[PDB]
């Protein structure tokens, strides 16, 4: 295989789930673990417990590829931001730095309209 000394916790933290993609500094997701990856789907995909489970599974894969030092790259808001953060902290990946990597269309494109249920 290979070893990644420093990783990046690219957390696609959708309210649906926190896809914790660990990425080498090159910019390649060496592995990822989401709520479904642990086994959480539907509402359980969006439960806070799924967040630390996904983060911990990703960090276990990180150790499996010898990853210890990771800076945290959290995407948009979801379920279990700080939860996945201290999961990664408690799973062999120290926090390093936290960065809210969220897209900012500064009054740009048009989305769908809305939901009323």
């Amino acid at each position: 295989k290979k070893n990644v000394p420093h990783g990046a916790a690219h957390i696609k933290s959708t309210f649906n789930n926190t896809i914790v993609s660990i990425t080498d500094p090159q910019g390649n997701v060496i592995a990822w673990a989401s709520s479904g990856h642990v086994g959480f789907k539907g509402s359980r995909k969006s439960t806070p417990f799924a967040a630390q489970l996904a983060a911990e599974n990703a960090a276990r894969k990180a150790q499996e590829h010898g990853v210890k030092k990771v800076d945290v790259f959290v995407k948009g808001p979801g379920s279990g931001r700080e939860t996945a953060i201290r999961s990664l902290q408690a799973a062999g990946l120290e926090v390093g730095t936290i960065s809210d990597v969220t897209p900012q269309p500064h009054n740009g494109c048009r989305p769908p309209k809305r939901r009323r249920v």
């Binding site: 806070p48 417990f49 630390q52 939860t83």
Partner: protein, 156 residues
Amino acid sequence: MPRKGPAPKRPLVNDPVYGSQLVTQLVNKVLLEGKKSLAERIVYGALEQAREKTGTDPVVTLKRALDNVKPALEVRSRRVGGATYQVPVEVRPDRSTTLALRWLVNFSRQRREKTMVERLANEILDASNGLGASVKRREDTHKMAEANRAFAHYRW
């Protein structure tokens, strides 16, 4: 009288034979509701039985057992947002002592010796050494209060 502040409690005297508050609280908890002198005799004989089977002062042995059973975090039954989110709360010394002694009595009456004198003595021994039902329940409650730390910051 809740909703108005701390509730005043009935004071507890020490045991006449032994002279310890924990002993008397254990007496009142092993006290089958209706008789005390016979319950006092039963807890007595249990404490002497623990004495020869340990060779030490029964009050100190009971203190060691209570320490080996006293909890530190308690879980209430608050309903938050229609979902059962467990919020651990630090236990005051009196509440933790009461919980430990209640567990000790409940698992004492569970044992299958000839008399609850023997059952309570064996429960005291199994809580002092750390091999009884009370000790394993103390372990399990702390394990479950640590497994749900994500809900521990609610501070209620």
